[PDB]
Design a protein around this ligand. Sequence first.
Ligand code: NAG
Ligand code: NAG
Ligand code: NAG
Ligand code: NAG
Ligand code: NAG
Ligand code: NAG
Ligand code: NAG
Ligand code: BA
Ligand code: BA
Ligand code: BA
Ligand code: BA
Ligand code: BA
Ligand code: ZN
Ligand code: ZN
Ligand code: ZN
Ligand code: ZN
Lengths: 443, 444, 430, 441
Amino acid sequence: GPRVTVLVREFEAFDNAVPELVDSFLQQDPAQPVVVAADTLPYPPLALPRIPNVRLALLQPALDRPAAASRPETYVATEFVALVPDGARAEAPGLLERMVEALRAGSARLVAAPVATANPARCLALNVSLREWTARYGAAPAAPRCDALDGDAVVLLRARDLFNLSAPLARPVGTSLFLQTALRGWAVQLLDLTFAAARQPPLATAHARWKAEREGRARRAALLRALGIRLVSWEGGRLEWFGCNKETTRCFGTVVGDTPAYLYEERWTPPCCLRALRETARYVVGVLEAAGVRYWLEGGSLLGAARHGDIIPWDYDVDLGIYLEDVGNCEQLRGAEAGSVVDERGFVWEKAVEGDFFRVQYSESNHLHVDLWPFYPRNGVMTKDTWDVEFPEHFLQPLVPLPFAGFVAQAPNNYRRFLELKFGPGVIENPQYPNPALLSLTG
Amino acid sequence: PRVTVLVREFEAFDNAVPELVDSFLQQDPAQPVVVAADTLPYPPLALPRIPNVRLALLQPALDRPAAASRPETYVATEFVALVPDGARAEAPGLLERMVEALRAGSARLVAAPVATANPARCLALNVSLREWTARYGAAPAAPRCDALDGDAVVLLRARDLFNLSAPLARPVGTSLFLQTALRGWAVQLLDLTFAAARQPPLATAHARWKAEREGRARRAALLRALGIRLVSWEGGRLEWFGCNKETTRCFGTVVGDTPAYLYEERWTPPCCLRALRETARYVVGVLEAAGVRYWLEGGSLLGAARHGDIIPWDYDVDLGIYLEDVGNCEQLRGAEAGSVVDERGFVWEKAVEGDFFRVQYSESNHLHVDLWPFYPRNGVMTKDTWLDHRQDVEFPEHFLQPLVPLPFAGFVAQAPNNYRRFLELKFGPGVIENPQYPNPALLS
Amino acid sequence: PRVTVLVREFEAFDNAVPELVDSFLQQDPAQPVVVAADTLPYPPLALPRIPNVRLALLQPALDRPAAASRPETYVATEFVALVPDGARAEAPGLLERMVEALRAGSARLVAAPVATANPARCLALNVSLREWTARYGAAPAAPRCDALDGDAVVLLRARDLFNLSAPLARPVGTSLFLQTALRGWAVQLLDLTFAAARQPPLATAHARWKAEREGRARRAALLRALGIRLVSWEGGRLEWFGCNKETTRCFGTVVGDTPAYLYEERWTPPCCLRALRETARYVVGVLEAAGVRYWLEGGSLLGAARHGDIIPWDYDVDLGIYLEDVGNCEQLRGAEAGSVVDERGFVWEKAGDFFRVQYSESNHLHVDLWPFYPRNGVMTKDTVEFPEHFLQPLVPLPFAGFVAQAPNNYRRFLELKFGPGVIENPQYPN
Amino acid sequence: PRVTVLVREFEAFDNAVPELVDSFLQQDPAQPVVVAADTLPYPPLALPRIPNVRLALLQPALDRPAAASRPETYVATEFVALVPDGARAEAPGLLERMVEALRAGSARLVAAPVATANPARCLALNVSLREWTARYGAAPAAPRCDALDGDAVVLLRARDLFNLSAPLARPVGTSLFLQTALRGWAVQLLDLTFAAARQPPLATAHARWKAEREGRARRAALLRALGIRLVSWEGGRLEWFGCNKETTRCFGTVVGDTPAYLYEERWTPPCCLRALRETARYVVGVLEAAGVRYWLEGGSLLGAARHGDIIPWDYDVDLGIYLEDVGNCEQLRGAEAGSVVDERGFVWEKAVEGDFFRVQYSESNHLHVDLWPFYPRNGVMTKDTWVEFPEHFLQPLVPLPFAGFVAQAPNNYRRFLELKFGPGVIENPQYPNPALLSLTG
Ligand SMILES: *[C@@H]1O[C@H](CO)[C@@H](O)[C@H](O)[C@H]1NC(C)=O
Ligand SMILES: *[C@@H]1O[C@H](CO)[C@@H](O)[C@H](O)[C@H]1NC(C)=O
Ligand SMILES: *[C@@H]1O[C@H](CO)[C@@H](O)[C@H](O)[C@H]1NC(C)=O
Ligand SMILES: *[C@@H]1O[C@H](CO)[C@@H](O)[C@H](O)[C@H]1NC(C)=O
Ligand SMILES: *[C@@H]1O[C@H](CO)[C@@H](O)[C@H](O)[C@H]1NC(C)=O
Ligand SMILES: *[C@@H]1O[C@H](CO)[C@@H](O)[C@H](O)[C@H]1NC(C)=O
Ligand SMILES: *[C@@H]1O[C@H](CO)[C@@H](O)[C@H](O)[C@H]1NC(C)=O
Ligand SMILES: [Ba+2]
Ligand SMILES: [Ba+2]
Ligand SMILES: [Ba+2]
Ligand SMILES: [Ba+2]
Ligand SMILES: [Ba+2]
Ligand SMILES: [Zn+2]
Ligand SMILES: [Zn+2]
Ligand SMILES: [Zn+2]
Ligand SMILES: [Zn+2]
C-alpha cells in the first residue's frame, strides 16, 4: 500500500495544470492518494477523477460540515506527505519512493526535489527571529542541506510533522512552511532528483503570470503580517517591510502602563518602529545642530549608545536633553510652544501636555517620537523645575561624540559616570531584556 | 458534574471579563475557565494567572503547534458553558442546575438568559444553504427554540460544540444557532437567570457605539463566509449581505453555462435574483414606453410558464425584440455607438459575440438582460448570427401574433401565444414539466 | 467519562514518561495529561507542548501564585487515573472501563495492575496513629484491598483524591493507601491489565539500584513526616523509621510529667518503647551479673502485671534495688564519681536519690534505679515505703521481652502503691 | 473586626506568644488570632479555648483534610497582621490605625516596628531570578521600602498574602519581602510603634544562641528552595547559598548542550560563575608562570570584549594555547598521562574526546576551564580535531580585562571575534530565549 499522499496547495483557480498533475501521478499507481486543498471550491471545475483516492479538501468553515472537514490531516492516511506545486508532473516511476528512502536514511526532517520549471528550487539559509519580527534569508552555506527553498520543489516530510505545525498549508506554502520549520531548527535536504514540468505549463502568458504574482504577493503580505514578520532581508540587505511607516499608525498604538503591547507578546520593538525612531532621531539631531541647539543623548538613548551604539532593542522612544536657553534658536521649537507644528518634512513638534518637554513625532499619523528635555544651570547643576535626575553641569562641559542609531550624536563627557549616576552602578554591562513571565506576574 | 466556562464574546477595548471570571472563581476557586480570542487582547486582560484559567488564542503562530489554536484541547470537562461578557455568577450552583436540566431534557443545548438590558429570547430558525437564506421567527414551542436573540449562558456537551465546523465564530449568538438549527438541534430556554455586571462594559454611549459597529462588521463577515446572503424575520423585515447596485455580482464569469454556485450545490443567490428581476422590470418598462415589441425568450419564458419567475438557478434574463424596432428606443440607438449609462444607472450595450443587446444592472454589477433582435423573413422569425445553443433557433412569426400577458418576476410580461408549444419547439417535449440544469453533461 | 491521566512516580534521571504520555495521546489526541513534579525534571521530559498536556511543579516559587502548586487546579475532569512510569496505553477504552467498574462497584478506588516485573498485589492495611504504626498483611477479601504493593493504574474521583491531606506525596503507593485506609476506603483490584513500556526505564543494574536508594530515602522521609515510626508485616518483618542508638529520642525534655506525644493525642513512639525495653534488659543483665537485688517498681511493675510490657504511653522504666548491693556493680560505683559510659554505650549517672541509665549518649531514654534499705522490717529511702516481706521472696514476671523480678503478691503490692483496681482500670490519656 | 493577628515567627522552647495573644484579647476579647506552626508546639502554648483564637498546624497529616494545612482556611477577615513573637498590644486602636494608613496610601503592605532591641529598619531590595541574587541596600525613598530588617507588625490584605506561593515560609522576615519585592509591591513603615512583651522571649545568651542557629538553618533552606544563590548588601558583604569547592556544581551534567538553568528560565548560578572566574584566574596564573602562550577564545573572548566578564548564561571558560608550550607546564604534562589533582585541588585532565585539556575547579565541582592547543603551519593556527585563523592575530597578544583580572587576547580581537562568530556579534548578544527553547528543545 502507498506510503505517500500527494498534496497540492499552490495553484491558481483561473489558470492551473492541476488535472495534468493528478493524472500524471495516477498513471504510475492508479491507487496513489492525491489531495488537492483549497479555501473555496476551485472554479472553473477541476474535474479530477471521481475515485476514492482523489479528494478535494476545502479548508473553509461551512454550516453543514463537521470540524474534521476543514482539517487537512483528515484527508491523509499515509505516513508521508509530498507537497507538490502546480506545474510539476510525475514521469519517472518511483520518485516518491526514493524520496522516502532518502528521508529515513538522512537526518533532515524534510527532503525536496526541484521541479524542472523556469524557476527550480534553490537551497537557502533562513534565520527567523520572532523577538525582532525578522526573517533573514541568505545563501545556504551547507548546501544541499538548507533551512528554506526558493522556487519549485516537491517537498516530502512526515504527515505528523506537517500537520502539527500551526499553519501547515498557509499560502504561499513556499514561504509559510520554511518559516515554521526553520524556526523549529529543522532542515530540508535538497535531493539530486528532478520532477518533470507539466507538458502544458500553467500561467504561460505574461498577463496570467501578472495576475498570479499579484495575488501571491498579496497572500504573502497578509501572511507575514498575521505571523508577525515585519522585515524580510536577503544577505542583510534588500529590505522588504511589512510594518508601520510615515503614512500609517505605529505598530503598537497607544501605550498603557508604560508596557507596550509587544512585550506581552514576548517580543521586542518592531523593526519598522525602530527604523522610524532612528530616522526621527537623525532628523531632529540634524535640525538641532544646524539651528544651534546644544543637545546630548539622555537616559535610555545614551545607555543604548554607550552599550552598542543603537536604540535598546526593546525601547520605543528616544530621549535627548537640551539647553533651555537655546530653544529660541529653533523655529520648530519656537512654534511648538504656541501649538502643534507640522514641519516641511511631515515631522510634528509639540510642547508636552504637562511636564514641560518637547516631543517630535515621526508624522501626523505615526506617533513614534523623540523627547527633548530642557535643562538650565542653577549654580553648576542642571535642573528642570518640572519632573529625570538632577546632575552637575560639568558633564556637558564639553560634550563628546558617540555613535548612535547610524550617525554620530553628542553625549555628556564621561558618559559612563553619567549613566550610573542616573541608573545605578554597572548599568552599561548588565542589560536586562524584558521578562514576560515577570511581566505576567506583575501586570 | 464538571463544567468549563468559555468566554468568547467581549471587546478588548472595553469589557467586564475580569469581573466575570472572578465571579465564578469566588464560587469555586478551581473552576476551569477558558477565555478565547483571535489575538492577544491589549490592554492586557490581566486574568488571574492560575492554572485553571487559560487564554486560548485562535490565531496561527510560527512557534505554536496546531493544537494551541484548537479550543477543544483547552476543555477537558464533559460540559462547556458559553458565557457572554456583561454576565456574572451570583447565585451558587447555577451551572450544576443547567447540567441537571440538560441530562433530564431532550434538547442538546440549554440556556439561561442574563439580566442585562437585552436578555435572550426564544426564536425559530430555518436555514437553507441552497437559497443562501436564514429565516427567523417567533418560537412556536417555547421555551424550546431553534435559536436565541440576546444574552444567555448556553451549556452543551464539549463533544457537540467542538464537532461544529466553526464553534466559536463571532458573533457566537448568530454563528452558533445557525449551525445547531441546521442540524435539527434545539436549545431549551430555562427559567434561570444569571446576573449582570456591577460595572457593566460599554458604559458610555461612544463605547457602545463603536462596539455595535464592530459587531455589525463581524456579523456581516460571518454571513458572507458562511454563505447567508439574506436574513428574514417574522414581520417580513429583511437584511441583505450580497449584491447591490454599487458592488460586483456575486459569482463572476460563467464557463460551460454552469455558474460556480451550482458546483457548490447552491442555487442563484437571492440578491442576484433580486437585481435580475428589477432589471427585467425596468427594461420592459423602457421598451414598452419606447414602442419596442418584446417577448419573454429562452429560460425566462420557461421560468414564466413554470412558476411566473426566474428559474431559481438561472443567472440572466432573455427577451426577444423585433429588429425593426430598435430605432424606437433611445438607449438602444446609443448602444450601437457604444456603451450607454442611462438615467437610472443601467448600462446598455451591443454585445461582443452575437449582434444582440445587453442591459447591465449597473456599471459594477453585471447582472443583465439580453435582448435578441429578430426580423420576419417570410412569416419566419430569424437573425443573422447564432449562438451555439439548442435554444437558439428560428420560429414561426405567428407565435408573435398576438402576444399574450404572462406574470414574470413580479410584473406582467408579454409572451408568445401558445408558449407551451413555443417552449417545446425550442427545448423539446415536456420541457415545462422536467426542470434540469443549463447543461447536465457537466452537472445535473 | 472524562479522565485525566496523572503521572507522579518517575525518576528524572531515567524514565519512560515520554512514551507513557505518547501512548495515551495515540488513543485520544486531546487526552488530558498532567505530569506532576517537585522541581523541573532535567534532562528535559520534552513533553508535547499542547494545551491538554501540562507539567505541574509542586514546590513553592518566588514568581508563582499559591494556585500553581495545588494540583486540583490542573485537573478539571471528574475522574483521575494515577499512572506509574513504566506503563503504556495499548488497547483503547481502558480508562472508561475502569470508570464503569468504579461506578458499578462499592470501592472508592479501582486499580488495574501494570504488566511490569512487579504488578500490583492486594494487601491488608491497618493504620494506628496513636501507636505511630502501620500494619500490612495478606488481604482476606481480595480482590477488595486496603492497599497495593507494586505497579498499578489507580482511578478515583478527583474530589476524593484532592481532599486528601497529601494526595501526591511520594512514594504514592505508600502515601495514598495510608490516607485512604485510614478513612475506611477500599481499592478494588480489577482484572484489567495495562501493558508495560516498550522501552522500560531502569534497564541497567546501576540505574535500578540508584532508583531504589532514592525511593527508600523518599519513603523514609514520608513516614517520618506523617508519624509512622514502624511498618510491620504479617509474618514478623519490621521496618523502623524512628530513633535509635545514634540519634536523639523522639520527644525530648518532658515538662510537667506530660511528654509531647500525649498532646498530639498519640502514645509513646514504638521506637522509643523498643529502646526502653532494650535498656531494661541490658540493665537487668548487668545487675544480675553483679549480684544486685532488683525488683520492678512503679509503672513498670504495673505494666508487667497488666500485660507483661511497658505501659504503652509511659516513657521510662523504674526498678528498685537494695542499697546495700550498689557496691557490687562497677558502673554504679563509677556513677557516684561521675557519668559512666560503658562498653556498650549506656550512660550511668547519679544526679537526686537514684541512679539513671540512658540508652546512649545521644538517646536519653532511661531506666531509673531507686535504692532502698531495710531498717524496720520496712523498705525505705531517705529523700513511699512498703514492708520488706514483699521482697522475700521475689517472683518471676514477664516484662518487655524477658523474665524480670517482681515483689511477691505484686497485685497486693500494686494496690498499696496506686489504689484499688489499678491493674484492671488503666488511666488512659485523653 | 477586620484584622486577624497571625503569629508565625516564634520558638516552641522559649516564646512570649501567650502574652502576645492575651494583649490583643485584653483590648478586644473578640479579636481573631491565629498562631501558625508546622507541628504542635511543645511545651503547650495554653492559649484561650475560644472560637476566635485558633492554632493552625500547617503540616500535612494522615487524619486531616487538605484544608487544614492551608492558612487562608483560618482567616476570615479582609486584612492580616503578621506579628512577631516579642510584641505586645498596649495602646488601643493600633490595628485600625494600620488599616486606615493602608487604604489611604499606595503601598500594599504597611508596617509598624515593635520596640524591641532590633526594631524594624527600612530596606531596598531587588530580586533577580535569572541571576539567583537578592540585592539589599539602604532604602532611597524611606519610609517607603522594599523590605524590612527587624521586628515589625506587617499588615496587608488576606487576599494578597495567601495568594503568594509561600506566604508563611520561615523566616517570614526574609520570605515575605522576597516575594512582595519581586512583585513590585512596597511596604510603608509607619510612625507607629508596638510595645515589647513585658517578659521578652530568648532573654538568655543560650536561648538566643539556639534560636539564631535554628533561624539561620531555616533561612539557608529557604533560600536554596527558592533559588536565591547569593545575597548582597550594597553590592558587598556577600552571603552564598550555592556550590563551592567541596560540592557538586549546581546543574550537574549538561545534555543539551543546554544546562538545566536555561529550562528554568534563568542564567548561570552566580556561585558557578564565581568558581569559573576563580578557576580561570588560577589557570591563567599557572600558564603565565610556566611560560605558556595563552589567549582568550570563543565566548570567553566574546564576553571579555563585550563587558569584560564571562557571559552570564555561559557555563565554562575557553582558552587557546600554543601546543609546543604544553611541555612547559607540569600539570599539563601530567594531564597527558592521566588525571592530576594539583596542590590546590584543581583537576587537570586531557579529554581524549576532542584532543584538548580541561581544568576542573575541584574533584567534586566540575566547573572547568578548557585549553585548546593550536600549532602553526604556514602562518595559520590549526589543530587536528574539531575554525582555524591566521597567526598574526597572536603577534602580538594584547591585554584585555576579563572576570576580575587582566587576560591575554588576540590583537584586533573585534576582527577576530567577527571572523569566528560573524559581524556585529559583540553588539548583538544571543540572549536566552525560553519561548524558543520550549519550541526547539
Ligand atoms: C543565521 O545565523 C547564524 C548564526 O547566528 C549566522 O552565522 C548566519 O550568518 C545567519 N544567516 C543569515 C542569512 O542571516
Ligand atoms: C494572584 O497572583 C497572580 C500573579 O501570579 C495574579 O495573576 C492573580 O490575579 C492574583 N490573585 C489575586 C486574587 O490577587
Ligand atoms: C420553518 O420551516 C418549517 C418547516 O416547514 C415551517 O413550518 C415554518 O413555517 C418555518 N418557519 C420560518 C420562520 O420560516
Ligand atoms: C507538536 O508540536 C510541539 C511543538 O510546539 C511538540 O512539542 C510536539 O511533540 C509535536 N507533536 C508531534 C506528534 O510531533
Ligand atoms: C486491622 O484491623 C483488624 C480489626 O479491626 C485486624 O483484625 C486486622 O488484622 C488489622 N490488619 C492487619 C494487617 O493486622
Ligand atoms: C472536596 O470535595 C468537595 C465535595 O465533593 C468539593 O466541593 C471540593 O471541590 C473537593 N476539593 C478538591 C477537589 O480539592
Ligand atoms: C535596585 O535596582 C535599582 C534600579 O534598577 C537600582 O537603582 C538600585 O540601586 C538597586 N539596588 C540595589 C540594592 O541593588
Ligand atoms: Ba525610557
Ligand atoms: Ba438561460
Ligand atoms: Ba442566456
Ligand atoms: Ba512512671
Ligand atoms: Ba561555549
Ligand atoms: Zn512599526
Ligand atoms: Zn448577488
Ligand atoms: Zn523513638
Ligand atoms: Zn553553583
